């Protein structure tokens, strides 16, 4: 080298795209069991991602969500249009393919057609708190008897997906895979790295593990 480093900035230690989920849904009537599908935004799903966001106790960031979507027919039509709807937390949600929760005016939605560069949009920092909390040590209720940890803290919206075309002969099944990255990170208060494999996706519960590998003898 010849100057101060800049590959170990907080902004470059984070802010890398990663797969976080994928899901399926297929053309069909509202009767059909799977014909819309949803994913709740959380960063605790993927172990690798989770590790690097438990380096810090508090974070605030905007995030970008890009969905890349493919489709294939199955054994024996016009180009399909897909709708991706973001529901901010505390909004209405659909329970079926046809509802007035897809017609609601306060839920952002992206209409996108195949053969175009994949849809994306950013979601700005949302929370009444001044940072997301990656550790919490309280209860939901005002007397201790609530739910321990991750209560109303770390609550973000959720996506929904459906086809926008009418059903037509021959089912089409789509697979949409979600990529996620934060941007404009700021971190406050560091933590020691996690040492034990994750168990639950909502608790810090762990099974005891050895600190380190054995050696053949301490002397050289």
């Amino acid at each position: 080298n010849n100057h101060v480093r800049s590959e170990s900035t907080i902004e470059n230690f984070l802010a890398r795209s990663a797969c976080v989920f994928y899901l399926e849904y297929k053309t069909g009537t509202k009767e059909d069991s799977n014909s819309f599908n949803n994913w709740v935004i959380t960063t605790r799903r993927v172990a690798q991602l989770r590790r690097k966001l438990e380096m810090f106790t508090y974070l605030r960031f905007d995030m970008e969500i890009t969905v890349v979507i493919t489709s294939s027919q199955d054994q024996s039509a016009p180009v399909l249009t897909h709708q991706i709807m973001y529901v901010p937390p505390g909004g209405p949600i659909p329970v079926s393919v046809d509802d007035y929760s897809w017609q609601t005016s306060t839920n952002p939605s992206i209409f996108w057609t195949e053969g175009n560069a994949p849809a994306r949009m950013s979601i700005p920092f949302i929370s009444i708190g001044n940072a997301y909390s990656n550790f919490y040590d309280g209860w939901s209720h005002f007397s201790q008897a609530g739910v321990y940890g991750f209560t109303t803290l770390n609550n973000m919206g959720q996506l929904f997906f459906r086809h926008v075309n009418k059903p037509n002969p021959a089912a089409i099944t789509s697979v949409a895979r979600i990529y996620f990255k934060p941007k404009h990170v700021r971190a406050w208060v560091p933590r020691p790295p996690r040492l034990c494999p994750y168990i639950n996706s909502t608790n810090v519960n762990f099974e005891p593990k050895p600190v380190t590998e054995v050696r053949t003898n301490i002397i050289t």
Partner: peptide, 21 residues
């Protein structure tokens, strides 16, 4: 330790107030 969040003895239980204080 600011915001020390404790585990639970069994790996599917949830700790209650009287055992964490």
């Amino acid at each position: 330790v600011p915001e020390a969040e404790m585990g639970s003895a069994q790996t599917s239980g949830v700790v209650n107030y009287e055992h964490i204080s």
